Amino acid sequence: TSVDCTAYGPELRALAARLPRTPRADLYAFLDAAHTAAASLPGALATALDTFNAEGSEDGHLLLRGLPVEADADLPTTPSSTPAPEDRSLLTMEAMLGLVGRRLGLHTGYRELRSGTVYHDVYPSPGAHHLSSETSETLLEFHTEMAYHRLQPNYVMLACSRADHERTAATLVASVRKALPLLDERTRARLLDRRMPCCVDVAFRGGVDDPGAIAQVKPLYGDADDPFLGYDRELLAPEDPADKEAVAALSKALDEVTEAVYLEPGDLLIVDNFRTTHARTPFSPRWDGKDRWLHRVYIRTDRNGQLSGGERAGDVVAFTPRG
């Protein structure tokens, strides 16, 4: 689902100007300012966000196009490392992630990931691990983000400050609502609410006492007529022949319903992480200071066990595997 925000430029630039200019120096105050400002988002944008937040969509994502973004020459050099300096001045796409993010829910950091930070710069880095956002030449395979984490976020938001030079990197999404109809009843029944072993990303490894402590992921769960999805192409490890068969059918159906989006500066993609897997195709970095640069945040909502009380936008949570 897409929303052309070009006409909202003036109003959005003004809302961004309401926010503290050094976000990380007091991130709780920054996100509180963004929440108050979110109540003034242009009506059609606010309605699209609230509708997506409550209902999701058949295609599993909400793409905002044409948000205000700095001209290329007016942006800093593309980052070469993580974490970001706490003194970094606010970028317009970060302001948009603050506004749009708080309209949906609570920004959340993960202790073991990206130094426990909340705003993550996504840029290519040499020798990247194959499951990493730092990849470029190799395809980043379809996966639900942190499917194995008890505190898995409802949304992953990606805002583009710079696209790759040749604009070849495409962000791919596959929605369980489009894939499900392609599966037969036997396959759906096998997957629904069925726990299967799942490895975790690099950041969360360590401390696994035995095979019994390995995370367990239900590939489909919830309402049988409109299930949530948990899938990770590389990490999910079905053991019985029937489970493998079922996961392979699910993998094929997701491939068959793949939708591609080329993020350009000013674009902000909201992925429904409980119903949609995402991936990114290959691109070749130039290592010239102007490589692809996205900003990523994770958003928790009141849906399914993400919150237990007292949480604030800006909190950083620790790891607990599902199971």
Residue 256, marked binder = no
Residue 292, marked binder = yes
Q: Cα–chain-centroid distance for residue 217?
A: 18
Task: Please give the Cα distance from 292 to 241 (Å, whole number).
Answer: 41
- What are the phi and psi torsion angles at 314 (to 5°)? 115, -15
- What are the phi and psi torsion angles at 196 (to 5°)? -130, 145
Amino acid at 211: P
Q: Cα–chain-centroid distance for residue 89?
A: 23
Strand intervals (E) in 11-119: 61-65, 106-107, 109-110
Q: What is the dihedral of CA 56, 273, 5, 79, to 10 degrees?
A: 180
Task: Please give the Cα distance from 125 to 134 (Å, whole number).
Answer: 5
Encoding tokens for residue 173?
A: 């999404």
Query: HSE of 3 in the Cβ direction (CA atoms, 13 Å)?
Result: 23
Sign of CA dihedral 259, 174, 127, 91: positive
Q: Which residues, other chains included, contact 256 with Cβ-Cβ below 8 Å and sequence gap of 6+?
A: 179, 182
Task: Please give the Cα distance from 251 to 67 (Å, whole number).
Answer: 33
Residue 145, marked binder = yes
Strand-pair partners of 120: 296
CA dist 318 → 53, 116, 149, 223, 286 (Å): 25, 9, 10, 28, 36
Strand-pair partners of 160: 294
232, 174 contact by CB (below 8 A): no
Task: Please give the Cα distance from 57 to 51 (Å, whole number).
Answer: 9
In the annotated binding site for Fe cation, the residues are: 143, 145, 278
In the annotated binding site, the residues are: 143, 145, 278, 292
In the annotated binding site for 2-oxoglutarate, the residues are: 292
